[PDB]
Design a protein around this ligand. Structure first.
Ligand SMILES: *[C@@H]1O[C@H](CO)[C@@H](O[C@@H]2O[C@H](CO)[C@@H](O[C@@H]3O[C@H](CO[C@H]4O[C@H](CO)[C@@H](O)[C@H](O)[C@@H]4O)[C@@H](O)[C@H](O)[C@@H]3O)[C@H](O)[C@H]2NC(C)=O)[C@H](O)[C@H]1NC(C)=O
Ligand SMILES: Cn1c(=O)oc2cc(-n3cc(C(=O)O)c(=O)n([C@@H]4CCc5c4cccc5C(F)(F)F)c3=O)ccc21
Ligand SMILES: *[C@@H]1O[C@H](CO)[C@@H](O[C@@H]2O[C@H](CO)[C@@H](O)[C@H](O)[C@H]2NC(C)=O)[C@H](O)[C@H]1NC(C)=O
Ligand SMILES: [Zn+2]
Length: 215
């Protein structure tokens, strides 16, 4: 998160920190959010050979009693997900058991908010602490330069006149508008110039329901 503020610890109790394993590279990291006690919603580009979720985290470097580290048994990447265009950049992770409900862990033109542990600048490392930023929802024309952006599938997020932005490491995290999840962090420019592209959750709600009911 570029240009944001440190979250009040545990104030976003649905946030999930994902550590993703690849067979031929070191670990990668993404965000996500708990939508049922045994399901996390994230971006399809955060798929890997295996994933661990950490719920209850603020400072991700320091283990505390709020932490619940949970195994993912199965990854449900959207069947139409496209690795080039990042169309249908959405994925459900089924956890091995249901999370415990605690104060720190629970399920979940206008201004919206996004949180994550991603980098705080192009050249900066990932944040130790959960950060949050308020971003403007833009008209789709603002995202035209992303040649494969589609207004029906995706939100266009972040006033280009501000530096404020989600960035590397924030992928998979939710965008909340009036407290309801409306987007998933998907992609943007390497130079962090807003706006960025988010998955439009509303479009995928039938598919979300289909996975949950079968699992
Ligand atoms: C992920 O999305 C990719 C981008 O849309 C998919 O690649 C596209 O797949 C379609 C088939 O579904 C191909 O459609 C064909 O296009 C040719 C014309 O190709 C030439 O012209 C375009 C520019 O107009 C250029 O981009 C191409 O490279 C070629 O020079 C038609 O003659 C065919 O009838 C048909 O419509 C696209 O060409 C193709 N685009 C690219 C850039 O590869 C990809 O298949 C998706 N992957 C998955 C697994 O879903
Ligand atoms: C499909 N697509 C597209 O049209 O433009 C594309 C950009 C990329 N692409 C490339 C990067 C690079 O080259 O280093 C790069 O760093 N990032 C990071 C990763 C997440 C992110 C980046 C930058 C700005 C904002 C965000 C986000 F968090 F808001 F999503 C990136 O998304 C990934 C596919 C696309
Ligand atoms: C997050 O937790 C880590 C681990 O406790 C903190 O890291 C320490 O930071 C101080 C300086 O601020 C260093 O001198 C220590 O060596 C660090 N310890 C380790 C083991 O890395 C970090 O400050 C915390 N971050 C916050 C709260 O922003
Ligand atoms: Zn705590």
């Amino acid at each position: 998160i570029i240009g944001g503020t440190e979250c009040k610890p545990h104030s976003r109790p649905y946030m999930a920190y994902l550590e993703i394993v690849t067979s031929n590279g070191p670990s990668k990291f993404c965000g996500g959010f708990l939508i049922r006690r045994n399901f996390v919603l994230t971006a399809a580009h955060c798929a890997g050979r295996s994933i661990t979720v950490t719920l209850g985290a603020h400072n991700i470097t320091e283990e505390e009693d709020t932490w619940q580290k949970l195994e993912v048994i199965k990854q449900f990447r959207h069947p139409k997900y496209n690795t080039s265009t990042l169309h249908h950049d959405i994925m459900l992770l089924k956890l091995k058991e249901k999370a415990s409900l605690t104060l720190a862990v629970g399920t979940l033109g206008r201004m919206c908010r996004v949180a994550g542990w991603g980098r705080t600048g192009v050249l900066k490392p990932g944040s130790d602490t959960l950060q949050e930023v308020k971003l403007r929802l833009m008209d789709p024309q603002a995202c035209s330069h992303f040649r494969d952006f589609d207004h029906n599938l995706q939100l266009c997020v972040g006033n280009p006149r501000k530096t404020k932005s989600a960035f590397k490491g924030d992928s998979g995290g939710p965008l909340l508008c009036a407290g309801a999840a409306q987007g998933i962090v998907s992609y943007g420019r390497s130079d962090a110039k807003p706006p960025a592209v988010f998955t439009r959750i509303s479009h995928y709600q039938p598919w979300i329901n289909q996975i949950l009911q079968a699992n």
